[PDB]
Amino acid sequence: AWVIP
Amino acid sequence: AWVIP
Amino acid sequence: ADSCIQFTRHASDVLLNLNRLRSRDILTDVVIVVSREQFRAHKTVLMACSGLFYSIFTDQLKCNLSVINLDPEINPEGFCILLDFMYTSRLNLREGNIMAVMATAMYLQMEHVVDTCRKFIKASE
């Protein structure tokens, strides 16, 4: 996996 | 885009 | 093949176009009912994202249903957030919705979402 897009 | 996978 | 080339952006472009078809209600083939709310979607996208929908639409009788009614304990906002995630890869996870999103993801059998919900809850305790 999860990220800040 | 195109790459060698 | 072993000699293939790969277009890096292809999978995300496909998903973006499937979400555009959903937005315009093009070739949607099922309505998911979550108490008083209705959500139009594509069965193949649901099956590709959820173990519960894969089980439902591979059933020899349920594969032909045009309406699927979810358990009344399922929160419609929670379902909306997960349906948007299925079509975009983006999860709108907030303090006010995390418990409903986690409960919905457990029911829909979407383990990666369950896992991030558990991590955010654990960080706050």
Place this chain on the structure above:
Amino acid sequence: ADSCIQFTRHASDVLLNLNRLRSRDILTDVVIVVSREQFRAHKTVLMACSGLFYSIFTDQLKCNLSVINLDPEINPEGFCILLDFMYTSRLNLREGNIMAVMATAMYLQMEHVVDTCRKFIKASE
């Protein structure tokens, strides 16, 4: 939402599962005929990848067809390679098939494939 988190692998996982449904012939809803060969597929995947299939399946009469016959000048191997590309992001481009792949991609209106074919041809001249 602006507060979303994103699962990087989601779009590729969805595409991998749609290709698994295609392999097992699950919920395929159209047969594409390319002279003597038949290819089963999902209309939404075709529309998400090809300008020609988007035009065909948004037509008020053609959207309901279960069989679509391509122009007889289309090479079946060329079509097979592009259908595999639609479902995997991988293009099996070879000296022996590049002209047929490029011609098929121009017809299907798949510009990124046309572009790489032009680059590989140009490099060899």
